[PDB]
Amino acid sequence: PFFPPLYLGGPEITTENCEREPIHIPGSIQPHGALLTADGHSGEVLQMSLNAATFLGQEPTVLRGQTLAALLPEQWPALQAALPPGCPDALQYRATLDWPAHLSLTVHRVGELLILEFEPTEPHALRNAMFALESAPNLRALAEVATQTVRELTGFDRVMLYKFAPDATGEVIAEARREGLHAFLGHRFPASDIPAQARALYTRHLLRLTADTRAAAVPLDPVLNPQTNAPTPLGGAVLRATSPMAMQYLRNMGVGSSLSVSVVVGGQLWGLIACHHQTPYVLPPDLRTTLEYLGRLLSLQVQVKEAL
Ligand SMILES: *C/C=C1/C(=C/c2[nH]c(/C=C3[NH+]=C(/C=C4\NC(=O)C(C=C)=C4C)C(C)=C\3CCC(=O)O)c(CCC(=O)O)c2C)NC(=O)[C@H]1C
């Protein structure tokens, strides 16, 4: 069972209990965006990331108790209709907000709570990218095409296809990398490097990232959902703070930015499209949506090719 989180008297995580870190409820976000939670009926703002002023122009204690009807009059009705009570928690409402300078708005529902993510935002290629994946004559060719295509889309210094063995050990079976980088191709890693609860989370929530592996997490306050007096589920929030233990591994690797997309075959975590940048790097929200779609196409092509 999960340890309590740090804000409920839980211990700091060590290599003795990697698998017990409740990574889905860090009660904090990454600083390149802002997060609000709001009542799924009233639209009352219940929780604020402490950096909410940077992106929304109001401090946490001023946003708290205001309604989305007031804060987002243009979107609040469509938001309500798009994410009704009982809808699946993977279902997203997406808008582009005009701000005095665009801001990408991503919302999902967890029970009676709306989770709002704000971050700055900036087809003939993508179609040939899809046909290129379809046209790979074997799994290795597919792996190479997938990593090259994602590297061209994103500009990431390294894109790997990280495949799980039945014992949950991991191997780099293909990679596209910048001139001068060490090869990881064929290198194998222990199961503990991506522990059991991360693997579980990655079967349901198919994309996660650390834009800056040195950035302190920004607290969500109040940290507990006032509805439940319990932690706010952030497994579906891309602005979710990353495991400190994971962040440290990346820093030691010389990685300033990390992003991965789940490859899911027959409802099991087959592997990851695993991306690194040496410098901190925010992949624009448009390019993430594209990478999500490519992971789903790649997941289907892997299932086929691997039967052969
Ligand atoms: C005692 C805890 C440990 C730990 C925890 C941990 N690791 C992750 C997530 C990831 N680890 C990855 C590992 C690798 N990336 C690479 O590039 C290579 C080798 C070339 C390896 C072995 C990957 C890809 C992930 C996924 C996230 C990402 O893409 O960066 C988590 C979950 C993090 C989160 O989602 O919040 C956790 C808790 N890792 C350890 O090594 C030990 C110390």
From Swiss-Prot:
UniProt PTM comment: Contains one covalently linked tetrapyrrole chromophore. Lacks the cysteine conserved in plant phytochromes (at the position of Met-245) that binds chromophore. An engineered sequence used for X-ray crystallography forms a thioether link to biliverdin through Cys-18. The natural sequence can bind phycocyanobilin and phytochromobilin in vitro, but the identity of the natural chromophore is unknown.
PAS domain segment(s): 20-88
Effect of M245A: Binds PCB (in vitro), but difference spectrum is altered
Coiled-coil stretches: none
Residue ranges occupied by any GAF domain in the UniProt entry: 138-302
Outcome of mutating M245C: Binds PCB (in vitro), but difference spectrum is altered
Binding site for a tetrapyrrole: C18
Domain of life according to the entry: Bacteria
Function, in words: Photoreceptor which exists in two forms that are reversibly interconvertible by light: the R form that absorbs maximally in the red region of the spectrum and the FR form that absorbs maximally in the far-red region. Also has a slight blue shift for the far-red maximum. Could also absorb green light. May participate in regulating pigment synthesis like the carotenoid deinoxanthin which could protect the bacterium from intense visible light.
Similarity annotation: In the N-terminal section; belongs to the phytochrome family.
Name of the protein described by the UniProt record: Bacteriophytochrome
Organism in which the protein naturally occurs: Deinococcus radiodurans (strain ATCC 13939 / DSM 20539 / JCM 16871 / CCUG 27074 / LMG 4051 / NBRC 15346 / NCIMB 9279 / VKM B-1422 / R1)
Residues of the full protein shown: 7 to 321 of 755
